[PDB]
From Swiss-Prot, chain B:
Subcellular compartments: Cell membrane
Gene behind this protein: CASR
Part of the whole protein covered: 694 to 794 of 1078
Protein's name in the database: Extracellular calcium-sensing receptor
Function: G-protein-coupled receptor that senses changes in the extracellular concentration of calcium ions and plays a key role in maintaining calcium homeostasis. Senses fluctuations in the circulating calcium concentration: activated by elevated circulating calcium, leading to decreased parathyroid hormone (PTH) secretion in parathyroid glands. In kidneys, acts as a key regulator of renal tubular calcium resorption. Ligand binding causes a conformation change that triggers signaling via guanine nucleotide-binding proteins (G-proteins) and modulates the activity of downstream effectors.
Extracellular side: 41-64
Homology family: Belongs to the G-protein coupled receptor 3 family.
Organism of derivation: Homo sapiens
Record's comment on post-translational modification: Ubiquitinated by RNF19A; which induces proteasomal degradation.
Quaternary structure and partners: Homodimer; disulfide-linked. Interacts with VCP. Interacts with ARRB1.
Transmembrane segments: 18-40, 65-84
Impact after mutating F83L: In HYPOC1; induces a significant shift to the left relative to the wild-type protein in the MAPK response to increasing extracellular calcium concentrations and
Disorder noted: Hypocalciuric hypercalcemia, familial 1: A form of hypocalciuric hypercalcemia, a disorder of mineral homeostasis that is transmitted as an autosomal dominant trait with a high degree of penetrance. It is characterized biochemically by lifelong elevation of serum calcium concentrations and is associated with inappropriately low urinary calcium excretion and a normal or mildly elevated circulating parathyroid hormone level. Hypermagnesemia is typically present. Affected individuals are usually asymptomatic and the disorder is considered benign. Hyperparathyroidism, neonatal severe: A disorder characterized by severe hypercalcemia, bone demineralization, and failure to thrive usually manifesting in the first 6 months of life. If untreated, NSHPT can be a devastating neurodevelopmental disorder, which in some cases is lethal without parathyroidectomy.
Comment text on domains: The extracellular regions of the homodimer interact in a side-by-side fashion while facing opposite directions. Each extracellular region consists of three domains, LB1 (ligand-binding 1), LB2 and CR (cysteine-rich). The two lobe-shaped domains LB1 and LB2 form a venus flytrap module. In the inactive configuration, the venus flytrap modules of both protomers are in the open conformation associated with the resting state (open-open) and the interdomain cleft is empty. In addition, each protomer contains three anions, which reinforce the inactive conformation, and one calcium ion.
């Protein structure tokens, strides 16, 4: 499996055979092989490819904003 | 109609039932633009799902906002002319 | 291993035979309606899963309508304007012979 995916179970087959399934939004993985998609820390959100988490963004009417 | 009943509006057009003729021409310039708009890009209903993950809204895509603005803009050009003549008198 | 209940999904335990596993909850946009499911199924295009990810329930349509607190108010105003204009027109008609009209 790649860095952005996790393993899956094929019914009636040994553990050496699996499938690669994408991690959901809000979770990430950065391993060559992963059994689970690790959850993203608080105030952090997963990237588009779910490779690694990134910090969220603060929204407010700033003084330096053009408006 | 309000414009045709103003102190200094009818006299200029006369000698160029005329009141009715001028009520006809402006309304005809409004009728034509709407027909052209409908034949080219008619506004219709659209279903929006990207806004909410649980509920969906039914809107009315209005086609190019250039057209909607031109209706209001033509309407204002007439109101401004009427307001100017009435203010001078 | 204990069986996974409806709304859950199987998970791999590394280094162990496939008979032994763990149960993981399904995501929000998916559901599972069976026991010992290897994956969570996706709801249809116009359906959304319920709180417990066991089924899909239809979405709610939201639009401006007559039976809404905002709608009932706007209509009354339009009918009032129509009635006022009708009253004015009926007065000019009935008093057609006055010098003012
Ligand atoms: Ca087998
Ligand atoms: Ca082993």
């Amino acid at each position: 499996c790649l860095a952005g995916t996790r393993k899956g179970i094929i019914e009636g087959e040994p553990t050496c055979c699996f499938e690669c399934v994408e991690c959901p939004d809000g979770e990430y993985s950065d391993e060559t092989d992963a059994s689970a998609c690790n959850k993203c820390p608080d105030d952090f959100w997963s990237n588009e490819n779910h490779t690694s988490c990134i910090a969220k963004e603060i929204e407010f009417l700033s003084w330096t904003e053009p408006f | 109609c309000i414009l045709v009943k103003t102190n200094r509006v009818l006299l200029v057009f006369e000698a160029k039932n005329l009141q009715f003729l001028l009520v006809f021409l402006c309304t005809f310039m409004q009728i034509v633009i709407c027909v052209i708009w409908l034949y080219t890009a008619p506004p219709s209903s659209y279903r929006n799902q990207e806004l909410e993950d649980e509920i969906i809204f039914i809107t009315c895509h209005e086609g190019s906002l250039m057209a909607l603005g031109f209706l209001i803009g033509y309407t204002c050009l007439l109101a401004a002319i009427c307001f100017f003549f009435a203010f001078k008198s | 291993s204990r069986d996974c209940l409806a709304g859950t999904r199987k998970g791999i335990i590394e280094g162990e035979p496939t008979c032994c596993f763990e149960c993981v909850e399904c995501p929000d946009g998916e559901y599972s309606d069976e026991t010992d499911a290897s994956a969570c199924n996706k709801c249809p295009d116009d359906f959304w899963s319920n709180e417990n990810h066991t089924s899909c329930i239809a979405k709610e349509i939201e639009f401006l309508s007559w039976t809404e607190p905002f709608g009932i108010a706007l209509t009354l105003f339009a009918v009032l304007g129509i009635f006022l204009t009708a009253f004015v027109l009926g007065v000019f008609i009935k008093f057609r012979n006055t010098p003012i009209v």
